[PDB]
Design a protein around this ligand. Sequence first.
Ligand SMILES: *[C@@H]1O[C@H](CO)[C@@H](O[C@@H]2O[C@H](CO)[C@@H](O[C@@H]3O[C@H](CO)[C@@H](O)[C@H](O[C@H]4O[C@H](CO)[C@@H](O)[C@H](O)[C@@H]4O)[C@@H]3O)[C@H](O)[C@H]2NC(C)=O)[C@H](O)[C@H]1NC(C)=O
Ligand SMILES: *[C@@H]1O[C@H](CO)[C@@H](O[C@@H]2O[C@H](CO)[C@@H](O[C@@H]3O[C@H](CO)[C@@H](O)[C@H](O[C@H]4O[C@H](CO)[C@@H](O)[C@H](O)[C@@H]4O)[C@@H]3O)[C@H](O)[C@H]2NC(C)=O)[C@H](O)[C@H]1NC(C)=O
Ligand SMILES: *[C@@H]1O[C@H](CO)[C@@H](O[C@@H]2O[C@H](CO)[C@@H](O)[C@H](O)[C@H]2NC(C)=O)[C@H](O)[C@H]1NC(C)=O
Ligand SMILES: *[C@@H]1O[C@H](CO)[C@@H](O[C@@H]2O[C@H](CO)[C@@H](O)[C@H](O)[C@H]2NC(C)=O)[C@H](O)[C@H]1NC(C)=O
Ligand SMILES: *[C@@H]1O[C@H](CO)[C@@H](O[C@@H]2O[C@H](CO)[C@@H](O)[C@H](O)[C@H]2NC(C)=O)[C@H](O)[C@H]1NC(C)=O
Ligand SMILES: *[C@@H]1O[C@H](CO)[C@@H](O[C@@H]2O[C@H](CO)[C@@H](O)[C@H](O)[C@H]2NC(C)=O)[C@H](O)[C@H]1NC(C)=O
Ligand SMILES: *[C@@H]1O[C@H](CO)[C@@H](O[C@@H]2O[C@H](CO)[C@@H](O)[C@H](O)[C@H]2NC(C)=O)[C@H](O)[C@H]1NC(C)=O
Ligand SMILES: *[C@@H]1O[C@H](CO)[C@@H](O[C@@H]2O[C@H](CO)[C@@H](O)[C@H](O)[C@H]2NC(C)=O)[C@H](O)[C@H]1NC(C)=O
Ligand SMILES: *[C@@H]1O[C@H](CO)[C@@H](O[C@@H]2O[C@H](CO)[C@@H](O)[C@H](O)[C@H]2NC(C)=O)[C@H](O)[C@H]1NC(C)=O
Ligand SMILES: *[C@@H]1O[C@H](CO)[C@@H](O[C@@H]2O[C@H](CO)[C@@H](O)[C@H](O)[C@H]2NC(C)=O)[C@H](O)[C@H]1NC(C)=O
Ligand SMILES: *[C@@H]1O[C@H](CO)[C@@H](O)[C@H](O)[C@H]1NC(C)=O
Ligand SMILES: *[C@@H]1O[C@H](CO)[C@@H](O)[C@H](O)[C@H]1NC(C)=O
Ligand SMILES: *[C@@H]1O[C@H](CO)[C@@H](O)[C@H](O)[C@H]1NC(C)=O
Ligand SMILES: *[C@@H]1O[C@H](CO)[C@@H](O)[C@H](O)[C@H]1NC(C)=O
Ligand SMILES: *[C@@H]1O[C@H](CO)[C@@H](O)[C@H](O)[C@H]1NC(C)=O
Ligand SMILES: *[C@@H]1O[C@H](CO)[C@@H](O)[C@H](O)[C@H]1NC(C)=O
Ligand SMILES: *[C@@H]1O[C@H](CO)[C@@H](O)[C@H](O)[C@H]1NC(C)=O
Ligand SMILES: *[C@@H]1O[C@H](CO)[C@@H](O)[C@H](O)[C@H]1NC(C)=O
Ligand SMILES: *[C@@H]1O[C@H](CO)[C@@H](O)[C@H](O)[C@H]1NC(C)=O
Ligand SMILES: *[C@@H]1O[C@H](CO)[C@@H](O)[C@H](O)[C@H]1NC(C)=O
Ligand SMILES: *[C@@H]1O[C@H](CO)[C@@H](O)[C@H](O)[C@H]1NC(C)=O
Ligand SMILES: *[C@@H]1O[C@H](CO)[C@@H](O)[C@H](O)[C@H]1NC(C)=O
Ligand SMILES: *[C@@H]1O[C@H](CO)[C@@H](O)[C@H](O)[C@H]1NC(C)=O
Ligand SMILES: *[C@@H]1O[C@H](CO)[C@@H](O)[C@H](O)[C@H]1NC(C)=O
Ligand SMILES: *[C@@H]1O[C@H](CO)[C@@H](O)[C@H](O)[C@H]1NC(C)=O
Ligand SMILES: *[C@@H]1O[C@H](CO)[C@@H](O)[C@H](O)[C@H]1NC(C)=O
Ligand SMILES: *[C@@H]1O[C@H](CO)[C@@H](O)[C@H](O)[C@H]1NC(C)=O
Ligand SMILES: *[C@@H]1O[C@H](CO)[C@@H](O)[C@H](O)[C@H]1NC(C)=O
Ligand SMILES: *[C@@H]1O[C@H](CO)[C@@H](O)[C@H](O)[C@H]1NC(C)=O
Ligand SMILES: *[C@@H]1O[C@H](CO)[C@@H](O)[C@H](O)[C@H]1NC(C)=O
Lengths: 438, 442, 119, 116, 113
Amino acid sequence: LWVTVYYGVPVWKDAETTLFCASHNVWATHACVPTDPNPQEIHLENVTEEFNMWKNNMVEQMHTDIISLWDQSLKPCVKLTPLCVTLQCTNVTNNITDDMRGELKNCSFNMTTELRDKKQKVYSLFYRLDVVQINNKEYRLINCNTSAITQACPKVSFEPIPIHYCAPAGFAILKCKDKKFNGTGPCPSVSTVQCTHGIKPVVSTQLLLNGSLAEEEVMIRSENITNNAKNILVQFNTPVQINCTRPNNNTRKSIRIGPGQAFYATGDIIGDIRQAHCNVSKATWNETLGKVVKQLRKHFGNNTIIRFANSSGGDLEVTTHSFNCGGEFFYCNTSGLFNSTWISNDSITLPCRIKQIINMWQRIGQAMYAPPIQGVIRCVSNITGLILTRDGGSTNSTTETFRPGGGDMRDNWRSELYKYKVVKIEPLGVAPTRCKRR
Amino acid sequence: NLWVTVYYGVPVWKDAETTLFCASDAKHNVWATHACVPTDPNPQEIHLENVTEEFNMWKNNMVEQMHTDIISLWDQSLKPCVKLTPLCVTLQCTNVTNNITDDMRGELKNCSFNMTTELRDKKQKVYSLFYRLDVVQINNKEYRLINCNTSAITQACPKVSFEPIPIHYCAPAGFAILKCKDKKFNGTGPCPSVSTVQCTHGIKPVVSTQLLLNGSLAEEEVMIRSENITNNAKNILVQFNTPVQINCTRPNNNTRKSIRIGPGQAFYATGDIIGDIRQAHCNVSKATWNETLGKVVKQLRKHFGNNTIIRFANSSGGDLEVTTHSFNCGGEFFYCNTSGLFNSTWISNDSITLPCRIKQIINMWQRIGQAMYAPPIQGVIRCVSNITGLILTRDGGSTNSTTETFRPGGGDMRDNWRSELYKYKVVKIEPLGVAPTRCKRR
Amino acid sequence: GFLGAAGSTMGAASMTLTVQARNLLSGLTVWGIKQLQARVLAVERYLRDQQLLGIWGCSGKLICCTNVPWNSSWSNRNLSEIWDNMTWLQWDKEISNYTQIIYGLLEESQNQQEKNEQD
Amino acid sequence: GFLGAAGSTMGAASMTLTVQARNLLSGLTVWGIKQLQARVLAVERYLRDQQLLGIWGCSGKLICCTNVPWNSSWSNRNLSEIWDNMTWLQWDKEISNYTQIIYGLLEESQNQQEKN
Amino acid sequence: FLGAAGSTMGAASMTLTLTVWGIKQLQARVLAVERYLRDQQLLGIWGCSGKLICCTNVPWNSSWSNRNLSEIWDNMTWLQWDKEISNYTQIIYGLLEESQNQQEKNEQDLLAL
Ligand SMILES: *[C@@H]1O[C@H](CO)[C@@H](O[C@@H]2O[C@H](CO)[C@@H](O[C@@H]3O[C@H](CO)[C@@H](O)[C@H](O[C@H]4O[C@H](CO)[C@@H](O)[C@H](O)[C@@H]4O)[C@@H]3O)[C@H](O)[C@H]2NC(C)=O)[C@H](O)[C@H]1NC(C)=O
Ligand SMILES: *[C@@H]1O[C@H](CO)[C@@H](O[C@@H]2O[C@H](CO)[C@@H](O[C@@H]3O[C@H](CO)[C@@H](O)[C@H](O[C@H]4O[C@H](CO)[C@@H](O)[C@H](O)[C@@H]4O)[C@@H]3O)[C@H](O)[C@H]2NC(C)=O)[C@H](O)[C@H]1NC(C)=O
Ligand SMILES: *[C@@H]1O[C@H](CO)[C@@H](O[C@@H]2O[C@H](CO)[C@@H](O)[C@H](O)[C@H]2NC(C)=O)[C@H](O)[C@H]1NC(C)=O
Ligand SMILES: *[C@@H]1O[C@H](CO)[C@@H](O[C@@H]2O[C@H](CO)[C@@H](O)[C@H](O)[C@H]2NC(C)=O)[C@H](O)[C@H]1NC(C)=O
Ligand SMILES: *[C@@H]1O[C@H](CO)[C@@H](O[C@@H]2O[C@H](CO)[C@@H](O)[C@H](O)[C@H]2NC(C)=O)[C@H](O)[C@H]1NC(C)=O
Ligand SMILES: *[C@@H]1O[C@H](CO)[C@@H](O[C@@H]2O[C@H](CO)[C@@H](O)[C@H](O)[C@H]2NC(C)=O)[C@H](O)[C@H]1NC(C)=O
Ligand SMILES: *[C@@H]1O[C@H](CO)[C@@H](O[C@@H]2O[C@H](CO)[C@@H](O)[C@H](O)[C@H]2NC(C)=O)[C@H](O)[C@H]1NC(C)=O
Ligand SMILES: *[C@@H]1O[C@H](CO)[C@@H](O[C@@H]2O[C@H](CO)[C@@H](O)[C@H](O)[C@H]2NC(C)=O)[C@H](O)[C@H]1NC(C)=O
Ligand SMILES: *[C@@H]1O[C@H](CO)[C@@H](O[C@@H]2O[C@H](CO)[C@@H](O)[C@H](O)[C@H]2NC(C)=O)[C@H](O)[C@H]1NC(C)=O
Ligand SMILES: *[C@@H]1O[C@H](CO)[C@@H](O[C@@H]2O[C@H](CO)[C@@H](O)[C@H](O)[C@H]2NC(C)=O)[C@H](O)[C@H]1NC(C)=O
Ligand SMILES: *[C@@H]1O[C@H](CO)[C@@H](O)[C@H](O)[C@H]1NC(C)=O
Ligand SMILES: *[C@@H]1O[C@H](CO)[C@@H](O)[C@H](O)[C@H]1NC(C)=O
Ligand SMILES: *[C@@H]1O[C@H](CO)[C@@H](O)[C@H](O)[C@H]1NC(C)=O
Ligand SMILES: *[C@@H]1O[C@H](CO)[C@@H](O)[C@H](O)[C@H]1NC(C)=O
Ligand SMILES: *[C@@H]1O[C@H](CO)[C@@H](O)[C@H](O)[C@H]1NC(C)=O
Ligand SMILES: *[C@@H]1O[C@H](CO)[C@@H](O)[C@H](O)[C@H]1NC(C)=O
Ligand SMILES: *[C@@H]1O[C@H](CO)[C@@H](O)[C@H](O)[C@H]1NC(C)=O
Ligand SMILES: *[C@@H]1O[C@H](CO)[C@@H](O)[C@H](O)[C@H]1NC(C)=O
Ligand SMILES: *[C@@H]1O[C@H](CO)[C@@H](O)[C@H](O)[C@H]1NC(C)=O
Ligand SMILES: *[C@@H]1O[C@H](CO)[C@@H](O)[C@H](O)[C@H]1NC(C)=O
Ligand SMILES: *[C@@H]1O[C@H](CO)[C@@H](O)[C@H](O)[C@H]1NC(C)=O
Ligand SMILES: *[C@@H]1O[C@H](CO)[C@@H](O)[C@H](O)[C@H]1NC(C)=O
Ligand SMILES: *[C@@H]1O[C@H](CO)[C@@H](O)[C@H](O)[C@H]1NC(C)=O
Ligand SMILES: *[C@@H]1O[C@H](CO)[C@@H](O)[C@H](O)[C@H]1NC(C)=O
Ligand SMILES: *[C@@H]1O[C@H](CO)[C@@H](O)[C@H](O)[C@H]1NC(C)=O
Ligand SMILES: *[C@@H]1O[C@H](CO)[C@@H](O)[C@H](O)[C@H]1NC(C)=O
Ligand SMILES: *[C@@H]1O[C@H](CO)[C@@H](O)[C@H](O)[C@H]1NC(C)=O
Ligand SMILES: *[C@@H]1O[C@H](CO)[C@@H](O)[C@H](O)[C@H]1NC(C)=O
Ligand SMILES: *[C@@H]1O[C@H](CO)[C@@H](O)[C@H](O)[C@H]1NC(C)=O
Ligand SMILES: *[C@@H]1O[C@H](CO)[C@@H](O)[C@H](O)[C@H]1NC(C)=O
């Protein structure tokens, strides 16, 4: 037998490379390369590939790209450096309800004008979570000792847009088509694809929204299910509709703070003021929790009592379901959802709070001011997953407690990039053959 | 029997759009001609016999590329310069009446104000001379700059020159530039005489309205070019046979002062004019203009009728940039009143003087939010130029109109460079071909 | 010179292939990045053409003969009015419809030739 | 299509060399240099593989036959089940360690075949 | 590498076998690729691909250099030789291309019958 050389063999190895897109908005989908109108996909027969959900580099690349796009979209906007002054604030009265006593504040201050000589005296309505009292009373903005706020440009929209990540020449994307895959280990049913599907970068905590649903049964994933320091990702069989609203009729004022710079402040609510909230169903949530408990007992025995309790400790972003509903940032209290015990029509209402100075990506040093949205706001979304955590109950604990977690956004897009991997093609091979060169 | 045979290097091409780079003749200039690759001493042009190509002046990607490049260079050349944010204050202005003529009274203002020093806790009292077009009265009287409620001005860097320099546009490898060599081509249709080049000739990016200056001339006849001649919403590009000389001057003897407005930040104000005060103006010849207008009328009579009478009129409505002939005598921006030029009717020694005005806060490229302050120029200025074309517009005269009226136009600079790139197109080479032959591979 | 035989017949322009062959590879600021992508693009186009030639068995050749018979459905003109009464620019407009069929035929034929020769 | 014969045997995968040999050459903002550096790297990899093929005197071919004997110390399998009961992915794992030395032999013999 | 720079021509004929730094690296890579491709294409269009010494079909014109073969291969270096025939390089380069094209056409004609 003799050595024979083949160029064009179907062999690959695990690799790491930079992927590009295929698609006014924060995420510049208009600059990313156009998408192929025809989805190209080749099923791979009689091949099994090993996958690792918890060591995927696509997650890190997506995180970095999202953060960089966020940073880039904030450069040409107004800088609110003259906002860091002393404010004279008063409580808001005149048709406020019982559950809204002390959440809105009427603050007046002095402001610069388009001329460098003269100043104006203006006022605005602020949320109590945005102002810190200093020695009626006098306050200041919460970020005036750590960072400098930039006013988000009002024309851009915060609505996510699906993005497809493509592989360069010489690289391939392999997809696991198994419908009961748990993210780690061998996969019998494999295909190769050009680009990933439409993935929306939805930012939220404790709850996965507007994602994808499990095909047959609720999926439960973790890096080490017997280790309590690892988050547990739950994927739903069916979605749960949630209705979130802020029933206040707001106005927006424009203040000329410089030669070409405008500050968008809050005026006065035309009518009654009430609390923002969210609604979910009760029977649907009960059934979903029953299914999750049934799928949870395969790891902790068939006789353990499984109970859901609310979160405990941390900053306002971690202890609350935090999301963004049409330009306004909501932080909802979810103690009416994770409060139950399971032994071996109506609605659930989550009260929510609103902020306007936002620190994204867990960074210190950069903040953003979100201009008010005029009129009433409403939005409907699907709960398609959960992120839980387990406490270390020792000393012969026959009961388990799962409580909501989150805060790190890599687990959000790890739940959508779990059936994907990137490989490099090695097209040169040698084989023994029964011929010879003359 | 016949077989497919492959040929590599066949002379075939297609239409394409690509990134053309720049070449300039082998330092502070707005268009950074020092970063452009040097041009070969003698161009290599190849005349292509027996081939006829098709050209279109009005869908040409080179025009868009040139517009984008000019705007980008202009923006890039203004970044390291001084930001005049503290200049937006209240000014105390009085009329300048000292050795002035009656046609230039009320056009200059003597304005005093308070200014920041190099030290953050000190102030100074300074004064400057401003033009009436650059200040707004607010409630002697008190004024402010024209831009304090729209944008922020950036002082132009005083070592950067505004003079146009010829630019060559070159194609990458695998591309070519087809050049039409016909004389009676209107810029649309088949061109039966073609050559191929690697770079276009030297093109000067002159920014002006209503009049094309320092361009190229037609060789045999005055050329009228329009995208849709029977549509009155399309501009008419008129190319001359012989140029018309125009002399423009600003006679004042200006003085420049430097005011320190911060650590390493200077503001160049205007001091006092040494002598008398007079109006800036331009001069053209009357006989030459009459000859040119007669030739234009004769060549325009081939589109509208054998007998129709043709009359010209001045512009009507719009901002000062579009109603006047706007140009730049090497540092100073002129806005001249061209009303004695377009005033005549035609049926089938002396000079013409055009009074001009000077602005100092400039909004270029029809943009909003980015203004610019042009520092004053010391001494008397004078620039001499060739008129080599016109941009015209026709009035929509309905109801059995036997008269056609043409008025000067402009404002969009894509038409200024469409008149120089009208004979060029960019093509892509396809060197692979297949043909039948009796030859068979053994 | 370059493209000088663009109006010449298909037979007279077949002796100037090397003239067009060599003018295909070399023949931070605003102007800075407009020159690098041009070079990279030229290199990629040249490499694509070279690979296309190489996978047909015509690597390193200017005129290469193939084993694919000329299907008469593509064209029916005789050789006396193709190499003597036509030009490459005029010839391309006619057979621009059937190019990919011929490319696939050439690829499959060359691969079959290699496969049966190595056996 | 692309990588279609991944699970097919080594014999059946030798008829689809072009479908993968064709897709190795085609398919200052955030997405500015991620494109350019990747393009240059792909060009460099393709060129390196072409030079490596040229060293062994196989430039221009897909299947190349060589005179280097197959030593019975890399794989003891017979030429029956290799091309009928095995795949390229399984084959590459076994002889992955002995590749680099073979790349030496495949070169030297070539020059000898020219020297003789 | 460049070890025969001082030897005779005949002896040398036997042995022919972002950031500041990141921007500079890419230009070097592009330049290397460009030079390699240009040299390979120039060799290819002459019919000399795959060889280090290639015999051509173009007679030597005595006006290029009138020396005998004894004072070329036994008395000069390649750096000395390059200084003599530097003015005639492009003429020879065009002649080689025309000669190879004629060979291609003749091979086609031979296969035609
Ligand atoms: C999960 O997905 C759902 C469904 O896509 C999504 O709800 C949608 O939210 C968007 C954004 O808030 C809503 O679109 C707005 O709806 C009304 C009516 O059109 C208007 O307020 C808005 O138009 C104004 O604002 C735009 C901002 O860019 C401007 O461009 C425009 O000119 C107008 O000024 C805007 O269209 C949309 O209606 C809902 N859809 C439904 C069915 O409710 C939800 O937000 C997602 N969930 C999460 C958590 O992201
Ligand atoms: C059409 O073309 C004509 C002819 O080229 C052109 O007129 C020219 O204008 C330039 C710019 O104003 C003149 O050059 C200036 O001339 C004098 C004497 O040399 C000086 O004022 C200038 O030098 C000072 O300014 C420079 C600014 O960059 C500095 O670099 C320099 O150090 C000096 O401070 C400058 O040289 C030139 O003389 C005329 N030419 C003629 C023949 O009049 C005209 O402007 C063009 N038309 C248009 C609309 O562009
Ligand atoms: C916030 O306070 C401002 C004053 O600081 C209130 O606006 C004034 O309301 C009074 C009473 O109706 C009017 O007479 C004034 O003309 C208003 N303007 C000013 C500038 O004083 C405003 O109503 C308060 N808003 C809320 C929601 O309490
Ligand atoms: C969330 O659910 C609550 C409770 O059903 C809704 O509040 C009711 O709203 C209706 C009008 O739509 C009123 O007639 C009822 O009196 C309200 N009930 C209570 C207890 O206050 C609320 O509208 C729902 N919100 C959304 C966005 O669905
Ligand atoms: C989330 O909501 C729960 C109730 O749904 C809040 O718990 C109540 O807190 C109040 C004080 O705000 C106590 O008086 C009640 O006794 C608590 N109720 C129960 C049932 O324990 C909880 O504080 C909310 N979370 C917040 C505000 O962060
Ligand atoms: C513009 O006004 C300034 C003062 O604001 C004038 O300069 C003064 O002129 C008077 C009269 O000759 C002198 O006594 C002062 O010393 C000058 N300087 C100052 C700082 O007051 C200037 O002459 C005026 N210019 C014009 C053209 O009218
Ligand atoms: C900036 O100020 C100028 C000058 O006052 C404004 O121009 C005036 O705009 C008003 C709008 O009602 C018109 O009635 C006037 O006729 C304008 N005056 C002139 C001289 O043109 C301009 O609108 C202001 N710009 C902005 C953005 O507020
Ligand atoms: C303006 O028009 C004049 C007159 O046609 C041009 O001057 C000619 O320039 C050429 C080239 O240097 C000379 O050969 C001619 O002798 C000049 N003519 C005369 C009458 O002197 C001039 O070049 C044109 N362009 C500019 C920018 O001024
Ligand atoms: C433009 O033409 C005018 C009018 O001919 C010129 O003004 C004359 O200038 C001369 C000196 O050159 C004076 O003696 C005359 O009295 C002026 N005439 C008038 C009516 O004022 C002017 O110089 C010309 N300007 C240019 C730049 O050519
Ligand atoms: C341009 O100049 C002409 C004259 O050359 C101006 O027309 C004159 O305008 C004044 C008032 O400004 C009238 O008194 C005259 O009767 C007008 N003359 C004629 C012949 O109509 C014209 O207004 C100027 N254009 C401007 C200032 O925009
Ligand atoms: C005013 O606001 C303070 C600060 O939150 C709150 O404690 C207090 O109850 C309010 N009092 C009145 C009289 O509105
Ligand atoms: C605003 O300025 C006024 C006038 O100097 C002063 O009385 C007041 O305390 C300042 N601050 C405010 C209203 O917060
Ligand atoms: C900023 O002020 C807040 C509120 O008093 C305080 O908790 C925080 O520590 C301060 N931050 C820094 C960096 O000093
Ligand atoms: C996923 O399944 C694999 C076997 O396919 C198993 O090794 C692994 O532990 C599972 N992961 C879990 C149960 O979290
Ligand atoms: C939410 O769920 C509904 C019902 O299954 C479905 O039609 C819809 O597409 C889902 N997604 C969104 C973004 O509403
Ligand atoms: C999972 O966690 C348990 C408990 O801490 C530990 O003993 C075990 O080694 C972990 N498994 C792995 C694979 O690291
Ligand atoms: C909010 O108030 C405005 C002004 O009165 C009114 O036009 C608008 O309809 C209101 N929005 C509601 C009721 O949703
Ligand atoms: C949410 O709102 C929709 C209409 O937008 C309604 O049909 C649905 O019942 C609501 N869901 C809940 C849980 O209230
Ligand atoms: C959780 O519930 C307990 C008991 O009602 C309450 O004291 C605590 O504040 C709640 N925590 C959160 C984060 O909701
Ligand atoms: C948690 O559930 C218990 C048991 O039904 C109930 O008494 C309590 O109010 C619940 N907590 C809530 C709804 O916050
Ligand atoms: C400059 O400051 C002085 C002193 O405060 C003041 O009187 C004057 O009005 C200011 N403005 C001017 C001179 O425009
Ligand atoms: C230019 O001339 C062509 C004939 O070559 C003609 O078809 C076309 O209409 C002309 N364009 C005009 C008159 O605008
Ligand atoms: C302008 O004034 C200066 C300073 O006195 C003088 O040198 C120059 O000659 C004047 N320019 C003229 C009169 O054109
Ligand atoms: C313009 O000035 C030149 C000298 O620079 C002179 O020869 C010519 O006659 C002038 N033209 C007019 C129209 O005044
Ligand atoms: C221009 O020529 C016309 C036509 O002959 C004549 O009526 C007019 O007076 C002339 N203009 C002059 C000489 O200024
Ligand atoms: C208009 O009259 C002129 C006079 O020279 C003549 O040449 C031209 O043909 C006429 N136009 C027609 C007849 O359409
Ligand atoms: C045009 O001329 C008329 C009459 O001479 C005059 O009233 C008008 O202002 C002029 N328009 C311009 C834009 O110069
Ligand atoms: C236009 O020409 C007429 C006729 O000669 C003349 O009366 C009028 O003043 C002119 N208008 C100008 C020069 O603005
Ligand atoms: C152009 O065509 C003529 C006439 O057929 C022919 O004699 C001549 O050689 C051709 N020229 C070129 C350069 O092809
Ligand atoms: C080569 O050409 C140069 C430039 O013309 C000349 O100086 C030199 O003498 C020439 N050498 C020979 C050997 O002809």
